[PDB]
């Protein structure tokens, strides 16, 4: 029999799902969550062998381990050890589509563990083994005797070893298969790997047990009285002296308690359950749970006797909150939620898909510090410690079933087939049976990207039947199906519509206004941050804040899924799909996160932080309206620090303590602000600072900020008459301008500034030319490769029009001396295959004071695709350690993503000016720049600059950041106009028309001097 | 592995469910439903062995059959052959309740078949084997090689034998187990048996196949234009030249056709199914299908090539009807249905649960002739020929899934467990996949008596998701759960409420009026006809006709489930639970049908026929309002025959042709009716006669009848002065009265009429005494046995009060001669343990003309339970061949069940006066009797008489009808007052207060003479 090739068999001799059990024998040890000695961890050094097929495994492995097998640590994935190549694929299945049959070449991992069991465990009670996760299917042997079979990969599999274990030395043998019929339900967009990637534990229970318990909370309209209903299910012999005690604790203080004997209410004509008992505990003025204030209680269920002798104890964490939907609005504790969620994949920086507590805690801290209040367990149930840490730290959790058949054509082939109805149920129901006691979990999810079938509807309303306390959602079928209470499309745009046949993604504002539609909209996936991305996030959050039924969404996604490889010298470097020999692969589409693999923040994280602030600011006159977006907490750990700056020079500042009610308004009256008579723009900047240290933040954390323009003083002063005039000399090929120390040289053949001299030091390695092309971004490329070309992609439209190939032709290059200046007029045109795309007309005025003023007028054809860039390009010959600039910063910003950057004077190291994206592209641009100082050079005007050690040509050719080599000198790109980056999705043109260079005529002025 | 003890494994290598396939290779052979040679019947002589356990089966059976094995016919049940004892149980499981484990003693039947397969079948195509039903689980071997495993019992199991079959001699070996884990879902109230009880077939298909097809009909508001949507699914290689033709035929006339290549509409983001194709055929003025006019079309689906070469053809029957629910009303074709349904168990008279076409046709004819328009497939899917015969003959079908866990405590133990969610789905989904193309099936059913769980809800709304064309219902959980569109309680009463805890059965009129309730009410089970039963049916149908949302119900049930045993002389006799050694058993609760096991009608069938007439009559003045209850047919084969009778003597009659629109009204004006001056009551009787022969009825069938009282002539004449006076002689112990030939003798010790003499022939074997007790009915006993006594049962209240034990005490017995008569006054009292229950005072007047007038006054105590009877009892010494009576008849009727019997003069054989109920009880009563003639004796008055050869004492002692022996003479019971029989249920007191003898004082007069 081949159980891995049959969807009707998903388990053999596997125990029922339940909430996590520690099997305490002391109620005080359960209350404080002390470790239980009845639970043993089998994590550690296991013996491992690899085989190309399960049939190649010798049967002598069932008796003793092979001498040729290696020692590995469990949990791990054997693709991170050299036994296989991890396979990255987005939509296409990594195997031949032929359900439910897998290829004969099925990689097999044979794990073995030799251990000992105490004799007290064997005399009484039941001993079970728990596998928290095995990818994908596995067969279990205990002492050479077959125990059972498991198929699911993200839910624990539990087997009874009481009749298998022996005193002394015991050997457990697990045969794990890479591919199974369940892998057809596991088409998630991640790295496909395999192995025992989660914890292995051994649990000992008494003869009579606490088999299950369900804890629910019911409230009134005011949330001042609460009823905790705890229903307890036992296994074993029914005895009249058996009693249960349900105790609720806040810290060390008992709040409520209840003791009843076994026996339930009459339900049917035959009676009720004799092995179940329900307890109703009344709580007066409970402390409600939320993402703002995570108030937690400890619920201890003690199965004992009438004498008071404790048999067993099970403890859990209970949060008094109630999540429901009324009037098309999702309410938690009676208040409409605004979801600031993010999609999270379980990707360890070093160990692949093996998750520990440290990475969970770090990820939670960076999400909470960046104003994220929710998280999506995508696309599978997570590690049960993740949920507990979410309850402790206060994050909303959307628990999603491990179902995805994105590679099926059509996508609902398996979900409409009743033959796959059992197996899918085993991936849904058990999940609920594991996670219905966590208050962090507020929304159940059927899965992702599986079309719409009747199995989805059946499992959906099954969850509605068993657990009415949580709303449940599903994307497939167009996000309007009967299988969702919450509208959750992926990558739907704010204003424009994209009507695909029979699954149209209408705009969210239009979607809410459709005839007969009532449900709230929370985006399951939006704002694809794949590389240099996340443009239009301000539009998304403006729509969220303006519309009551637009309640936020989940950003895709948190962390890049890149794997560490090593070069010839052993230096580590991040790698993506296709770097391990896996073919076919979706090349860099595994990196969509807001942080790097080592949890280094991207510049997009600052924009996400600014757009998700819980404090909104409105400057009117000289007063500030501060509006809270907290729903349950008072502003008790926040103060407003304001400052006024004249062109980056501070003038006045102050600190005001914030006292704002939840979703309330506060007025702050600033003192008499300075009124300078010096030229420049006055900027008012406010920041919200937390003085005390929270469990997730440190003392002085900035949670919100805002900037406005105050009164402006335009400069009307005139420069003094420079005593020296520039000498202009005309050669047969060059124009040479002297000002004593400073010498400019223009080449009359190319028409560009050939060379600059200060003393005898050359300053330009390449001439100052025009640039209308950038290194293509991940949003620009989309899903277009060399083999398959997408004509809608921006990079393909640019290279089809010859933007990367067009050659500059010199139309005019004249020079003439003025009274106190030398005037250089140039005029070029860029042509491709006889078609003129761009025409540049520049005027260089060299004054006697030393400044060189460049006026640039660019004509762009309307029929050619809109250029990504209009500016200048040169390579300086000097590498300076510091870069100074008066402008927006200090992070990377773009025309469609700049609301987070503040206008000030920023000084940064040169290496900080380059964003180390794994896939090289355009990066490091700083918008709104009024002044730029680098070495001896100073540039003034209004421009967007990026300064780096890598040319745009090198950034275009190179596919990995570790292959980049620093070039001689420093590459500078000053641009009059720059095009937005997009970010609605990464397979369609996402740049809005307001951020496209579509005017046709552009003008910009620069001043180049030596400070 | 023990697959029969694991709910996660319900099949192994079993093919998907589909509508029935014949695999035609000629479209004309498919259109006419000619037999297909690609389908072979394996029914016939198989080799069979019996084993106490599957482990006791030798493996040599896998190679060749055992020499000790017998030859049986397939299909059959081996409990009908002596290998096992069939077990009857109602609620208690026949095995130890320990799911999913069955006892080690599991009876095993090993079937073997040796056959041959043509070599043309092996060269090309796929050969499969179909088991239409195997009870319960089975393992299959072909030529000694294991093929698969099946678990379901009422749905076909199909296995692929293409890679197993060989040229020449092939052997198939089936191991069938009596008990499995699926038997926990098979707790239906029937005879538990086992074996291959349905057909076994072998089907041959090509390489490319028609795997499935779904046919649906969509209408407009008028039902004049129809769209037939036929969706076709194929298996095999996808070729561009493959085409499908969907042809619709009415007789030999093609109505519509459509041809399209394979390829469907775009459904998801990945596209659509390339192996599916949908055809939309427009039909102009279709002939709608209903139970009144079953208009059928033949739909032929031909998979062929572009050249026109036919590959394969599949044909089905299509009825254009649309069943929906609006405004809380169930509409078929826009008209509100009034269900006249009945519950049917598949019980063959001789072969147990093996159903053939003859029994189906006969059952359908008796249902349609008795005004039944619907049937419930309870509690399991039926034989696929049953549905086809229902479409041909026009019966509505409620298809019910094979799920019932009535023995679980609580009843929803398995249906709330997600672990049983897969298996239950395999019993639901596949059923739909077999029966969604039959227009006879109008209502889907999840099952019966399983409580309410989340699995019921999930499967319910799964059926809603796949098949919206039919409403779907479920009883469990109190019949108000979210798992029903149609309210279907069992045995809910018309007016009185019975509030069980958490599952109350409120009265239907009150149920419809509950706050927030909207759905229509159709009773799934009502009017329990267990033996002498079905009282209050008139109340049920009055409630159905008065209330628009009360749309009828299903009577439980059609046929008695009794098995034929043989005595010492080989004479067959019907037997019930406990007659085969099965213990525990529910003794005669298997016989609840309206017909006997040999399809002999019970007297209750006449009442069912009269209460379900499609014609209602209202007499006003001398005109008759005839109202049709047909919804789709015109009265084209009906005429009204009226007659007027004076005390059973016909006077005038006539025949009027009926011309009534559907649910219309017609006035019939009778001619000048006779006006007799003779004494007596005039009765007007109307009958609806069908002159022509329908497919289900014969020429002259009576479908409805009604009777009214016309003007009455009270008798004021005086009897003549008799010349002779009776001589009265007083003895020391007797009173003797002479009238020449006729001599009466009263015993002065007992006070009763001791003897009657005509000539020298004695006429009484026992004296004429009072009787206040009857042989207890099945409704009177209820669920009370000798071991467990139910105090609420009527028989236990009667025997606890001493009604069957009370002794008559003589208070007064006097005699005195009158002028022309002799007057005998008697007065008794019945006492038990010093408590007087009844007091009888009789007056016997013996006139000189010959008549003996008896006036009886009975006083009944109020605190004692109300007697079932108040009348006289005697045993005549003469057995006459004929019984004549002027009164209601000619069938058995009772005070609460008499609306079907007509008042006339009926002459019947004596053997016809005894109803042969299998469990003996009170029977043969005739109500409203004005005159009774038997031998030389004549009785006049108003009384209820039953005349038989068996005493009430013998009917009480004896438990089987074959043990009854005819006594000397003839037992006669003339009763002044009789108590109703009940029939709302058979476990509670169902007799209404208006039919109980609760007045306290009663009076009746009789006249005894010699005609």
Curated annotation (Swiss-Prot), chains A, B:
The keyword Hydrolase applies. It catalyses: Hydrolysis of terminal non-reducing beta-D-galactose residues in beta-D-galactosides. The record marks 987 as: Important for ensuring that an appropriate proportion of lactose is converted to allolactose. The keyword Metal-binding applies. Mg(2+) 2 binds at residue 585. Induction: By allolactose. It holds the Pfam family Glyco_hydro_2_N. One of its GO terms (molecular function) is alkali metal ion binding. It comes from the Bacteria. Its EC number is 3.2.1.23. Inhibited by phenylethyl thio-beta-D-galactoside (PETG), isopropyl thio-beta-D-galactoside (IPTG), L-ribose, D-galactonolactone, lactose and 2-amino-D-galactose. One of its GO terms (biological process) is lactose catabolic process. InterPro entries: B-gal_small/dom_5 (IPR004199), Bact_Beta-galactosidase (IPR050347), Beta-gal/glucu_dom_sf (IPR036156), Gal_mutarotase_sf_dom (IPR011013), Galactose-bd-like_sf (IPR008979), GH-type_carb-bd (IPR014718), Glyco_hydro_2 (IPR006101), Glyco_hydro_2_AS (IPR023232). Its cofactor is Mg(2+); Mn(2+); Na(+). Homotetramer. This is Beta-galactosidase. The gene is lacZ.
């Amino acid at each position: 029999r081949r159980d891995w090739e049959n969807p009707g068999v998903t388990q053999l001799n596997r125990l029922a799902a339940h909430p996590p059990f520690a099997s305490w024998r002391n109620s005080e040890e359960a209350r404080t969550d002390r470790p239980s000695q009845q639970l043993r961890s089998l994590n550690g050094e296991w013996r491992f062998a690899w085989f190309p097929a399960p049939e190649a495994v010798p049967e002598s492995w069932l008796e003793c381990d092979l001498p040729e097998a290696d020692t590995v640590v469990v949990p791990s994935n054997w693709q991170m050890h050299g036994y296989d190549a991890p396979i990255y694929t987005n939509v296409t299945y990594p195997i031949t589509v032929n359900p439910p049959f897998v290829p004969t070449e099925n990689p097999t991992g044979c794990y073995s563990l030799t251990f000992n069991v105490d004799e007290s465990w064997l005399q009484e009670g039941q001993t079970r083994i728990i596998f928290d996760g095995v990818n994908s299917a596995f067969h279990l042997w205990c002492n050479g005797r077959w125990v059972g079979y498991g198929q699911d990969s993200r839910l624990p599999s539990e087997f009874d070893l009481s009749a298998f274990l022996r005193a002394g030395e015991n050997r457990l043998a697990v045969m794990v298969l890479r591919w199974s019929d369940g892998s057809y339900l596991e088409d998630q967009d991640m790295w496909r790997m395999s192995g025992i990637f989660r914890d292995v534990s051994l649990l000992h229970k008494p003869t009579t047990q606490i088999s299950d318990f369900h804890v629910a909370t019911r409230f009134n309209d005011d949330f001042s009285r609460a009823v905790l209903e705890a229903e307890v299910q036992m296994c074993g012999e029914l005895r009249d002296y058996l009693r249960v005690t349900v105790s609720l604790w806040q810290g060390e203080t008992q709040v409520a308690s209840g003791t009843a004997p076994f026996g339930g209410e009459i339900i049917d004509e035959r009676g009720g359950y004799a092995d179940r008992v329900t307890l109703r505990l009344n709580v007066e003025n409970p402390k409600l749970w939320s993402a703002e204030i995570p108030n937690l209680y400890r619920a201890v269920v003690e199965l004992h006797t009438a004498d008071g002798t404790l048999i067993e104890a099970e403890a859990c964490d209970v949060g008094f909150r109630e999540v429901r939907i009324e009037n098309g609005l999702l309410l938690l504790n009676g208040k409409p939620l605004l979801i600031r969620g993010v999609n999270r994949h379980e990707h360890h920086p070093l160990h692949g898909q093996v998750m520990d507590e440290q990475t969970m805690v770090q990820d939670i801290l960076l999400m909470k510090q960046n104003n994220f209040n929710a998280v999506r367990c995508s696309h599978y149930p997570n590690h049960p410690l993740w949920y507990t840490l979410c309850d402790r730290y206060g994050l909303y959790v959307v628990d999603e079933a491990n179902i995805e058949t994105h590679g099926m054509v059509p996508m609902n082939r398996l979900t409409d087939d009743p033959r796959w109805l059992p197996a899918m149920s085993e991936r849904v129901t058990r999940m609920v049976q594991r996670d219905r006691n966590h208050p962090s979990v507020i929304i159940w999810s059927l899965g992702n990207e599986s079309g719409h079938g009747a199995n989805h509807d059946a499992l959906y309303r099954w969850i509605k039947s068993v657990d009415p306390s949580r709303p449940v959602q599903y994307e497939g079928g167009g996000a309007d199906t009967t299988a969702t209470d919450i509208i959750c499309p992926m990558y739907a745009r704010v204003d424009e519509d994209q009507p695909f046949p029979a699954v149209p993604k209408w705009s969210i504002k239009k979607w809410l206004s459709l005839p007969g539609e009532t449900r709230p909209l929370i985006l399951c996936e939006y704002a694809h941050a794949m590389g240099n991305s996340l443009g239009g996030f301000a539009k998304y959050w403006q729509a969220f804040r303006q519309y009551p039924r637009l309640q936020g969404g989940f950003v895709w996604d948190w962390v890049d899924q890149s794997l560490i490889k090593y070069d010839e010298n052993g230096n580590p470097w991040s790698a993506y799909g296709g770097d391990f020999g896996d073919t076919p692969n979706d090349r860099q589409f595994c990196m969509n996160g807001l942080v790097f693999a080592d949890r280094t923040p991207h510049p997009a994280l600052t924009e996400a932080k600014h757009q998700q602030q819980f404090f909104q600011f409105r400057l009117s006159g000289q007063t500030i309206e501060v509006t809270s977006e907290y729903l349950f907490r008072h502003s008790d750990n926040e103060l407003l620090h304001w400052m006024v700056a004249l062109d980056g020079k501070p003038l006045a500042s102050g600190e005001v303590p914030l006292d704002v009610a939840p979703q309330g308004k506060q007025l702050i009256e600033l003192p008499e602000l300075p009124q300078p008579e010096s030229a420049g723009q006055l900027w008012l900047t406010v920041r919200v600072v937390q003085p005390n240290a929270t469990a997730w933040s440190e003392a002085g954390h900035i949670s919100a900020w805002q900037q406005w323009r105050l009164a402006e003083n335009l400069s009307v002063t005139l420069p003094a008459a420079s005593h020296a005039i520039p000498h202009l000399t005309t050669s047969e090929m060059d124009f040479c301008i002297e000002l004593g120390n400073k010498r400019w040289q223009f080449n009359r053949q190319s028409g560009f500034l050939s060379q600059m001299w200060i003393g005898d030091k050359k300053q330009l390695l390449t001439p100052l030319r025009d640039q209308f092309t950038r290194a293509p971004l991940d949003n620009d490329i989309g899903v277009s490769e060399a083999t398959r070309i997408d004509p809608n992609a921006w990079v393909e439209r640019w290279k089809a029009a010859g933007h990367y190939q067009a050659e500059a032709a010199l139309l005019q290059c004249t020079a003439d001396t003025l009274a106190d200046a030398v005037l250089i007029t140039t005029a070029h045109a860029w042509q491709h295959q006889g078609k003129t795309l761009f025409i540049s007309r520049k005027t260089y005025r060299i004054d006697g004071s030393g400044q060189m003023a460049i006026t640039v007028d660019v004509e762009v054809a309307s029929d050619t695709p809109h250029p990504a860039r209009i500016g200048l390009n040169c390579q300086l010959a000097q590498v300076a350690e510091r870069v100074n600039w008066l402008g927006l910063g200090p992070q990377e910003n773009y025309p469609d993503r700049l609301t987070a950057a503040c206008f000030d004077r920023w000084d940064l190291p040169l290496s900080d000016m380059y964003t180390p994206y794994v896939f090289p592209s355009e990066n490091g641009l700083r918008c709104g720049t009024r002044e730029l100082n680098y070495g001896p050079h100073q540039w003034r005007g209004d421009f967007q600059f990026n300064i780096s050690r890598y040319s745009q040509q090198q950034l275009m050719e190179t596919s990995h950041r570790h292959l980049l080599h620093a070039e001689e000198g420093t590459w500078l790109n000053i641009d009059g106009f720059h095009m937005g980056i997009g970010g609605d999705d990464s397979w369609s043109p996402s740049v809005s028309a307001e951020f496209q260079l579509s005017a046709g005529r552009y003008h910009y002025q620069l001043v180049w001097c030596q400070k």
